[PDB]
């Protein structure tokens, strides 16, 4: 189900890629997408699926398209068009200089100094969840630690009910990983039927939570709108529940498989941070785009005002001209080049929380369960979307070999 090639597209620039169902998914999602970088693929190519759109395939274009906010605007950053358009999260769907102010607020809530505040609850929870799991010698990493871990921290952050979890999550999921049960605009609505009443309540009688600062936030001398609030808190929900959740499963499936990687981390912990960056470069997962405010010629391709362009942040680090032996994990690379936290004026704000949640889990799980592996006969399945994932990750271990701490 492909749409007619638009006039301006040289059919030799065609390359039918389906972000919602890449071919080789069975072999893995980063591998699925890494096709785009074979020798036989143009640096910039046009795909006819999800209604036809450019996709830039190399480290350097993405970096370039990202810094160039002018012809490449965030206005509509989600393929397909309707969602992108129907998406209004702030600061996301906004170019600077507008953005600068909405962003500075979000940075208030999730930023650096919020992260030192939270560290202990993080570690406290990291230990507590692991130790619970320990003695069973089998979890469901995705439902068992992956889902739980990060969410409860955000629920802690935003002061919202755990009970809410399963609902917002489905909503978050449909948004990044469209099933077909509900369209983006419908998705965006129910997440909004939710937040709204909450934002009301924090306007009248404030709290210390992320949302409380957000409803009461200051933007360009004036007091933030209700809508701008609904809209900021919307982004936090999704970035909240959706990126960290998935990343942990790929990193963990990776460890379940490479006992020399567990070993290395375990004996030379001065390496968790480097290890941390290398894993983000490799188990990268986001893929949104931009929009052409006008006609423009990018690396000789005539870009026509209105066209969408995917700029997968996945691809930047999996690119040979950037990372020798891209698909191979090496905690001692000299230079880890990636753009998992995006790039440009829209650099990811929760990079600190995300990183901090990732080191905690590596340091803590290796401490208690140094040795685990994939459940005999289980086939892991990934999912591609605006943010990619793992269907479930059954693990198994020998209690006898763990350690409480």
Ligand X SMILES: C1C2CC3CC1CC(C2)C3
Residues annotated as catalytic are 177, 242-243, 348-350
Got the DSSP string for 254-270? HHHH-HHHHHHHHH-GG
Which residues between 353 and 392 bind ligand X (CB under 6 A)?
386-387
Under a CB-based contact definition with an 8 Å cutoff, are residues 283 and 338 in contact? no
Cα–Cα distance between 393 and 361 in angstroms, integer?
16
- In the bound complex, what is the minimum distance in angstroms from residue 329's beta carbon to ligand HEM? 17
**Rg (the chain; Cα; Å):** 21
| C-alpha dist (Å) from residue 344 to 85, 200, 293, 323, 336 | 21, 33, 17, 20, 18
Residue 353's binding partner out of ligand HEM, ligand X, none, with CB under 5 to 8 Å set by partner kind: ligand HEM
106 is written with which tokens?
């979000």
The separation between CA 47 and the C-alpha centre of its own chain, rounded to angstroms, equals: 23
Give contact residues for ligand HEM (rule: CB under 6 A): 77, 91-92, 103, 106, 110, 154, 235-236, 239-240, 243-244, 247, 285-286, 288, 313, 340-342, 346, 348-350, 353-354
65 binds ligand X (CB under 6 A): no
Cα–Cα distance between 329 and 340 in angstroms, integer?
16
Which residues on adjacent β-strands are paired with residue 383?
389
349 binds ligand X (CB under 6 A): no
Q: Which of 22, 217, 239, 385 binds ligand X (CB under 6 A)?
A: 239
Residue 240's binding partner out of ligand HEM, ligand X, none, with CB under 5 to 8 Å set by partner kind: ligand HEM
Residue 256's binding partner out of ligand HEM, ligand X, none, with CB under 5 to 8 Å set by partner kind: none
Sign, Cα dihedral of 142, 146, 148, 150: negative
Q: Write the binding mask 154 to 193 for ligand X: x where contact by CB under 6 A, - elsewhere.
A: ----------------------x-----------------
Q: 9 or 252, CB closer to ligand HEM? A: 252
Residue 318's binding partner out of ligand X, ligand HEM, none, with CB under 5 to 8 Å set by partner kind: none
Helix (H) / strand (E) element for 226: namely helix 226-257
Q: Is 276 annotated as a binding residue?
A: no
Under a CB-based contact definition with an 8 Å cutoff, are residues 75 and 287 in contact? no
Near ligand X by CB under 6 A, which window of 202-210, 235-243, 303-311, 365-373?
Answer: 235-243
Helix (H) / strand (E) element for 396: namely strand 395-397
Q: What CA dihedral angle connects 186, 191, 194 and 199, to 10 degrees?
A: -120
Q: 241 or 380, CB closer to ligand HEM? A: 241
Q: 188 or 282, CB closer to ligand X? A: 188
Report the 10 Å Cβ neighbour count for 262: 21
Cα–Cα distance between 20 and 33 in angstroms, integer?
11
Residue 72's binding partner out of ligand X, ligand HEM, none, with CB under 5 to 8 Å set by partner kind: none
Q: 347 or 378, CB closer to ligand X? A: 347
Q: 3 or 347, CB closer to ligand HEM? A: 347
Residues annotated within the binding site for heme are 348
Residues annotated within the binding site are 348
């Amino acid at each position: 189900n492909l749409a007619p090639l638009p006039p301006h597209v040289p059919e030799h620039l065609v390359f039918d890629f389906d972000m919602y169902n890449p071919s080789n998914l069975s072999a893995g999602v980063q591998e699925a997408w890494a096709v785009l970088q074979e020798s036989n693929v143009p640096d910039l190519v046009w795909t006819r699926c999800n209604g036809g759109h450019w996709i830039a395939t190399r480290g350097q274009l993405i970096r370039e398209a990202y810094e160039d906010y002018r012809h490449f605007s965030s206005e509509c950053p989600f393929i397909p068009r309707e969602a992108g358009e129907a998406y209004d999260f702030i600061p996301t769907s906004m170019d600077p200089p507008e953005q600068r102010q909405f962003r500075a607020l979000a940075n208030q809530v999730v930023g650096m100094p919020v992260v030192d505040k939270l560290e202990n609850r993080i570690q406290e929870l990291a230990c507590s969840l692991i130790e619970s799991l320990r003695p069973q010698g089998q979890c469901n990493f995705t439902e068992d630690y992956a889902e739980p871990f990060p969410i409860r921290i955000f629920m802690l952050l935003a002061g919202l009910p755990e009970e809410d979890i399963p609902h917002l999550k489905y909503l978050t999921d449909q948004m990044t990983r469209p099933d077909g049960s509900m369209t983006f605009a419908e998705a965006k609505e129910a997440l909004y039927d939710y937040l709204i009443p909450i934002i009301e309540q924090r306007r009248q009688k404030p709290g210390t939570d992320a949302i409380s600062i957000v409803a009461n936030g200051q933007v360009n001398g004036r007091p933030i709108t209700s809508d701008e609030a609904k809209r900021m808190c919307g982004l936090l929900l999704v970035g909240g529940l959706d990126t960290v959740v998935n990343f942990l499963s790929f990193s963990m499936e990776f460890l379940a498989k490479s006992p020399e990687h567990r070993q290395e981390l375990i004996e030379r912990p001065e390496r968790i941070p480097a290890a941390c960056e290398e894993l983000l470069r490799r188990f990268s997962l986001v893929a949104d785009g931009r929009i052409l405010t006008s006609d423009y010629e990018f690396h000789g391709v005539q870009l026509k005002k209105g066209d969408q362009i995917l700029l997968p942040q996945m691809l930047s680090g999996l690119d040979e001209r950037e990372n020798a032996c891209p698909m191979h994990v090496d905690f001692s690379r000299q230079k880890v080049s990636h753009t998992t936290f995006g790039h440009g004026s829209h650099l990811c704000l929760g990079q600190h929380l995300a990183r901090r949640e990732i080191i905690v889990t590596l340091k803590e799980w290796l401490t208690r369960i140094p040795d685990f592996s994939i459940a005999p006969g289980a086939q892991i399945q990934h999912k591609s979307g605006i943010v990619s994932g793992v269907q479930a990750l059954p693990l198994v271990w020998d209690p006898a070999t763990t350690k409480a701490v």
